[PDB]
Write a protein that binds this ligand. Structure first.
Ligand SMILES: C=CC(=O)N1CCC[C@@H](n2nc(-c3ccc(Oc4ccccc4)cc3)c3c(N)ncnc32)C1
Length: 258
């Protein structure tokens, strides 16, 4: 799956903490997004044993990996039009995104994470910046396999005792639910990365966002339960969001924000 580094990048989509991501072409006609990884902790060997990212991790709502170079890498994947969900919520599209759209995008994310769950895999960092948005509201999970930081998204079990499991990503899915229902705003508004750990251990949970039904805030608190194994399945989360406007909020009327 290793092609050589003679397919070159055109447009730089953005810069992040660990490497760059570019927009380019592959074999002359395929439009392709290429994530570069600078000399951070490039596991030129333990990175190529990452043959599972690409094997049977092919799902509708997972970003389809195409190829990898074996120096600095260029993870070759599909090109998602609207970029990251975080920008799509902050941007101009936020003005017209309502709850039915936000809950559909949450259902898609749960679907792809339900696939990662069925495959007994773990995605150690799930948030709105690691989810890509195409057109017609297609969300896909990206950035799943990086082991080698967002404390406001990580479950308390995994920040203090390194216990990352699929239930740990349920926790951040709940935090991600707040990003959808606040149009990209930063969780625990007003607090800092260590002020958050004191409050979560003491029992503090984020209140109900404005205009958001408590039906959906209760689903966050199920994802924010102290005991990991009592947090809901991604199978349950997917079905819950898929049926939401029929089994849970049939009296929902579209407001001015949600
Ligand atoms: C400036 C705001 C905005 O939108 N951003 C911010 C700047 C970067 C932009 N970015 N990155 C990717 C991408 C492409 C391939 C990839 O390999 C995987 C790594 C781990 C797991 C799965 C794949 C990782 C990320 C990417 C992409 N497809 N499509 C659009 N934008 C992307 C999004």
């Amino acid at each position: 799956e290793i092609p050589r580094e003679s397919l070159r990048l055109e447009v730089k989509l953005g810069q992040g903490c660990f490497g760059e991501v570019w927009m380019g072409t592959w074999n002359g006609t395929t439009r392709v997004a290429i994530k570069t990884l600078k000399p951070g902790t490039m596991s030129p060997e333990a990175f190529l044993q990452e043959a599972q990212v690409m094997k049977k991790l092919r799902h509708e709502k997972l970003v389809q990996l195409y190829a990898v170079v074996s120096e600095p890498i260029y993870i070759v994947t599909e090109y998602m039009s609207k970029g990251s969900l975080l920008d799509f919520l902050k941007g101009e599209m936020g003005k017209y995104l309502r709850l039915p759209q936000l809950v559909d995008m949450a259902a898609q994310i749960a679907s792809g994470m339900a696939y990662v769950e069925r495959m007994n895999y773990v995605h150690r960092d799930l948030r709105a910046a690691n989810i890509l948005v195409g057109e017609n509201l297609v969300c896909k999970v990206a950035d799943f396999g990086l082991a080698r930081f967002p404390i406001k998204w990580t479950a308390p079990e995994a920040a203090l005792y390194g216990r990352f499991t699929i239930k740990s990503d349920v926790w951040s899915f709940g935090i991600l639910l707040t990003e959808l229902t606040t149009k990209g705003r930063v969780p625990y508004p007003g607090m800092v990365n260590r002020e958050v750990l004191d409050q979560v251990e003491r029992g503090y949970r984020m209140p109900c966002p404005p205009e958001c039904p408590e039906s959906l805030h209760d689903l966050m608190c199920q994802c924010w339960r102290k005991d990991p194994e009592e947090r809901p399945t991604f199978e349950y989360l997917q079905a819950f969001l898929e049926d939401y406007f029929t089994s849970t909020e049939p009296q929902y009327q579209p407001g001015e924000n949600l």
